[PDB]
Each structure stands twice: as structure tokens, then as C-alpha cells.
Amino acid sequence: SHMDIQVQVNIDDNGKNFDYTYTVTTESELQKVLNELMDYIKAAGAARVRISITARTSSEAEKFAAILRKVFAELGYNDINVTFDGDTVTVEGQLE
Ligand SMILES: [Mg+2]
């Protein structure tokens, strides 16, 4: 339903790639999933990460953008780009 939040994750590490799709119901559940992704990226290293979140309003897209900017900064990415398509925010990070 439209109460759901959709999360798309692409973790691409010099040819070792992974793709995840999640449906989360609250900001709290979104944060749970993002913290698991951070755990994985910190342990394994990922050269490129792209996370897209389809929020429920345009204001919530910006709220989730702020969460993602902080995630990517905490993970140490050196090229971080935030884009919006409707209510969907995408953030892509790379080490170079
Ligand atoms: Mg879990």
C-alpha cells in the first residue's frame, strides 16, 4: 500500500555486487535497515553504494535525504551525490 516505504540498495565492490530491496513501514524501521547496511559496508568495504528511498511525501523525501547524507558521510565516501525524482531520493557514494 501507499503507507509503505520502498528501499533499493546496490552495493558494488570492484565486481562483487549485491542488490537488496526492502519495504519498511516507519522511519524507525528504515533506520534499522540502514544501520545493518552500514555494518556490512564497514566490515567488507564497498567502493560504490547507491541507495534509493521512495518516501510518502516530498518533505519526507528530504527528511530521508538527510538521513542518507549522514549515512554516506559516516561511511567515509569522498563523492556523495543526492538526487530527487518525485518522492524518491537517491544517494550515490564512491571512494574516488
Ligand atoms: Mg534485521
Numbering used by the authors: 0 to 95
Please quote the authors directly:
Top7 is a de novo designed protein consisting of two α-helices and five β-strands. Top7 is a de novo designed protein whose amino acid sequence has no evolutional trace. Because of the lack of an evolutional trace, Top7 is an ideal model protein to study the pure nature of protein structure. The high stability of Top7 also provides a suitable property for protein engineering.
We introduced K42A, Q43A, and K46A mutations and the resulting mutant was named Top7sm1 (sm indicates surface mutations). We mutated these two residues to serine and called this mutant Top7sm2. We scrutinized the crystal packing of Top7sm2 and found Ile68 at β-strand-4 to be a promising site for the mutation. We mutated Ile68 to arginine to introduce repulsive electrostatic force by positive charges and steric hindrance at the interface. We successfully determined the crystal structure of Top7sm2-I68R with a resolution of 1.4 Å. The crystal belongs to the P21 space group, containing two molecules in the asymmetric unit (mol-A and mol-B). As intended, the mutant formed new crystal packing without forming the continuous β-sheet string that was observed in the other Top7 structures, and the R values (R/Rfree: 0.20/0.24) were dropped to a relatively decent range for the resolution. Arg68 slid by each other to avoid steric crash and repulsive electric force, as intended. Although there is no direct contact at K42A, Q43A, and K46A, these mutations seem to prevent steric crash with a neighboring molecule by the removal of the long Lys and Gln side chains. K57S and K58S mutational portions directly form a crystal contact with the Glu28 of a neighboring molecule.
